[PDB]
């Protein structure tokens, strides 16, 4: 005989492992380009030491730095991936004005949004600044995933594609809503979209977004209607 739940789990684990394997394989390769550009603009330099003008320096130095910043972002994706695996991701909270955090995020996503003819808005039902004891870097990361998704899953047939961040306070905490009039999400998938790798049909997406919110002691969920759009809710403690 057999245990069907067990078999489904085993099969589920093997398919997830294939995906983790492909993730690790891809990031391994991407880490190569930078480590290449870094070395190049260096072992070459050292060896031609006795024959170099220092012009072949300020521009070149900028290269190692741009490349290094690229390798750093990649190592961070790998480290985020590892930390999410081990549930060891941490947050470092401080007093932050959520209004500024949101405007900045909206700013960073403006180019991509325009690229798809999607307008990004921000509304606060409470006077700014809206101070919260949170990890600014992490919640910016939260928000950006949310915003990027609002653009990516916008509804082609809508003349007014948009993604709007609504800020507010509730139940003693802060409620952030990222609303879009996109394609929406089917009922069977409203919890599953938060699982690593899941897609209704690198980055860590909604899975790290959920972990960041939960680490703050909050909750995230979605309310959506296919063809109409989705509202992702993020409730976090405000006070601390």
Ligand X SMILES: Nc1ncnc2c1ncn2[C@@H]1O[C@H](COP(=O)(O)OP(=O)(O)O)[C@@H](O)[C@H]1O
87 is in an annotated binding site: no
Binding at 183: pick from ligand X, its own copies, none (beta carbon under 5-8 Å per type) = ligand X
In terms of DSSP H, where are the helices of the chain?
4-30, 32-47, 58-86, 98-115, 136-152, 206-215
Binding test (CB under 8 A) with its own copies, winner from 15, 19, 33, 42: 42
Peptide bond into 129 cis (omega under 30): yes
Interaction pattern, residues 53-82, with its own copies; x per rule: CB under 8 A: -x---x--xx-xx--x--xx--x--xx-xx
Q: Which residues pair with 222 in a beta bridge?
A: 232
Q: Which residues pair with 225 in a beta bridge?
A: 229
182 is in an annotated binding site: no
141 touching ligand X, by CB under 6 A: no
CA distance 117 to 113: 6
43 touching its own copies, by CB under 8 A: yes
Where in 86-105 is the site for its own copies (CB under 8 A)? 86, 88
State the number of CA atoms in the 13 A half-sphere of 111 facing the CB.
1
End-to-end CA distance of the chain: 54
203 is in an annotated binding site: yes
Q: Quick one: which segment of 47-55, 96-104, 142-150, 213-221 binds ligand X (CB under 6 A)? A: 142-150
88, 121 Cβ separation under 8 angstroms: no
Query: Would you give the DSSP letter of residue 187?
Result: G
Binding test (CB under 6 A) with ligand X, winner from 34, 136, 182, 218: 182
146 is in an annotated binding site: no
In whole angstroms, how close is the CB of 179 to ligand X at the nearest point?
Answer: 9
136 touching ligand X, by CB under 6 A: no
Phi, psi values for residue 29, rounded to 5°: -70, -45
Query: Would you give the DSSP letter of residue 129?
Result: P
Of 206, 238, 220, nearest in space to 98 by CA:
238
149 touching ligand X, by CB under 6 A: yes
19 touching its own copies, by CB under 8 A: no
Binding at 42: pick from ligand X, its own copies, none (beta carbon under 5-8 Å per type) = its own copies
99 touching ligand X, by CB under 6 A: no
Sign (positive or negative) of CA dihedral 84, 136, 165, 157: negative
Sign (positive or negative) of CA dihedral 26, 209, 66, 71: negative
Applying CB under 8 A, the residues found at the interface with its own copies are 1-3, 6-7, 9-10, 13-14, 17, 21, 24-25, 28-29, 31-32, 35, 38-39, 42-43, 45-46, 49, 54, 58, 61-62, 64-65, 68, 71-72, 75, 78-79, 81-83, 85-86, 88
Binding residue positions for ADP: 145, 149, 152-153, 180, 199-200, 202-206, 230
């Amino acid at each position: 005989m057999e245990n069907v739940t067990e078999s489904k789990e085993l099969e589920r684990l093997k398919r997830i492992d294939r995906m983790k394997t492909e993730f690790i394989a891809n990031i391994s390769h991407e880490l190569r380009t930078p480590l290449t550009a870094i070395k190049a603009y260096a072992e070459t330099i050292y060896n031609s030491l006795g024959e170099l003008d220092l012009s072949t320096l300020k521009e070149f130095l900028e290269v190692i730095i741009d490349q290094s910043n690229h390798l750093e972002n990649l190592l961070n994706e790998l480290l985020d991936f590892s930390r999410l695996e081990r549930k060891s991701l941490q947050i470092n909270r401080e007093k932050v004005d959520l209004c500024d955090l949101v405007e900045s995020a909206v700013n960073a996503i403006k180019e991509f949004a325009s690229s798809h003819n999607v307008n990004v808005l921000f509304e606060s039902n409470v006077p700014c600044p809206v101070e919260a004891y949170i990890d600014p870097t992490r919640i910016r990361q939260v928000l950006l995933n949310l915003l990027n998704n609002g653009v990516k899953y916008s509804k082609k047939d809508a003349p007014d594609k948009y993604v709007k961040v609504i800020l507010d306070e509730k139940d003693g905490g802060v409620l952030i809503i990222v609303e879009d009039n996109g394609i929406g999400i089917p009922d069977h998938a409203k919890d599953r979209i938060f699982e690593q790798f899941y897609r209704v049909d690198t980055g860590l997406g909604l899975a790290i977004t959920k972990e960041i919110v939960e680490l703050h002691g909050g909750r995230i969920w979605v309310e959506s209607e296919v063809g109409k759009g989705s509202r992702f809710f993020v409730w976090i403690p405000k006070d601390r």
